[PDB]
Amino acid sequence: MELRVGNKYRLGRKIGSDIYLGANIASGEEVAIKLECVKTKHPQLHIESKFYKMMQGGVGIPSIKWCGAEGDYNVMVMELLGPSLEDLFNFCSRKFSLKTVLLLADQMISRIEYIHSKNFIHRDVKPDNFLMGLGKKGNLVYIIDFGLAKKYRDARTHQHIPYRENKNLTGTARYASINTHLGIEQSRRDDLESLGYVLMYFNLGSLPWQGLKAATKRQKYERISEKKMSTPIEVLCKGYPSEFSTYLNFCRSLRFDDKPDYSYLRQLFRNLFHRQGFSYDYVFDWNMLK
C-alpha cells in the first residue's frame, strides 16, 4: 500500500467532488489528481485532458502536469486550484458585494472570450465551474469542466456551425439563456447571457426562477423557461447598477453567429468599478472577516 503515480507524485486524501490531493515525492509541492476506471461506463477524463491540453497556454486554464495510466486507472495530475465561486459564495452567506461581482465579472468575461477564441463555447457557465487560484495565482479566476463544451466554428475557415432548433436543454437550467430554453443551438452569445445570470445571482443571493415547484424534470425546466421569460431584465436588475441590464440586454440581442464585443462588456463594468472608487486590489469578500 502507498500508491505513487507518474513516478513523481504520491496520491493523497480525497479533497473534492472525486479529486485527490497529491504531492511531489521530492518537493512536497501539492497537485490535484483525478482517476477514472478504464472500465467506467461514463468516461470524462480524456475529453477534459484534451481541453486543458488544447487550451494550454490560456490564463485561467488549469495546467496539466501529467497524463498516463496506472494499473487499470487513467490518471490526470493538474495544478491544484482553490475553491469554486459557489463555495466562496456560500462562505459569504450567498451575497457578494458590488466590488467583488465586478472583479469577478471582469475575469469571467475574458475567460469565456478565451474559450471562444479557441473555437469552443462552454455551455455550462455557472459559479461551480469557476475556481480561484493558489498563491501567486490566488487572485485569478479559472474556468473548468468542458464536459459539454462544443466546437462552434471551423478551426481553419471560422465557419460558424449551423443554426438549428429542437435542441435539448444542455447545461444548468437555472443559468440557461432564454434561447437555450427554446431549444436553439447554442453559440457564443449564450455563454455570455449565462454569465449575466451568474452575476445577478451573486448580486441577489438567488434568481427569481430558482427553487421553482415542479413535478418533472420536463415540468421544472418548463416553469423555469416561462419564469425567466416573464421577468424582464429591467425588473430583474431593479435595485442594481444599470450596467447589469445593459449587459444582459446586449447579450440577449447578439445574432446567433455574432461576435460579442467582449471589450464593450469589460469596459461597461470597468467604468462602473471606477465610478464607485474601488481599487483593483483583489480583496474579495471572502478575504475579509465575517
Q: Which residues contact 279 (CB under 8 A, 6 or more apart)?
A: none
Give the C-alpha separation, 187 to 150, whole Å.
Answer: 9
The CATH number of 12-21+32-81 is 3.30.200.20
**What resolution (Å)?**
2.8
Q: Where are the domains of the chain?
A: 12-21+32-81, 82-288
Give the C-alpha separation, 125 to 42, whole Å.
Answer: 22
Q: Which residues contact 45 (CB under 8 A, 6 or more apart)?
A: 34, 36, 74, 76
Quote the longest CA-to-CA distance of the chain. 60
Method: X-ray
Does the structural domain 82-288 have CATH classification 1.10.510.10? Answer: yes
Choosing from 124, 190, 191, 285, the catalytic residue is 124
Catalytic residue list contains 128: no
Q: Please check if 17 is assigned to a binding site.
A: yes
Q: Please check if 64 is assigned to a binding site.
A: no
Q: Please check if 34 is assigned to a binding site.
A: yes
Q: Please check if 161 is assigned to a binding site.
A: no
Give the C-alpha separation, 147 to 195, whole Å.
Answer: 18
Q: Which residues contact 114 (CB under 8 A, 6 or more apart)?
A: 55, 58, 59, 60, 61
Give the C-alpha separation, 91 to 285, whole Å.
Answer: 9
Under 8 Å between Cβ of 169 and 225: no
* H or E segment to which residue 194 belongs: helix 188-204
Q: What CA–CA distances, in Å, run from 260 to 54, 154, 190?
A: 23, 18, 10
Q: Which residues contact 214 (CB under 8 A, 6 or more apart)?
A: 220, 221, 222, 223
Under 8 Å between Cβ of 155 and 161: no
Is-same-fold flag (12-21+32-81; 82-288)? no
Identify the residue whose cell numbers are 475579509.
Answer: 288
Give break positions in the chain: residue before each, C–N beyond 2.5 Å.
17
Under 8 Å between Cβ of 237 and 248: yes
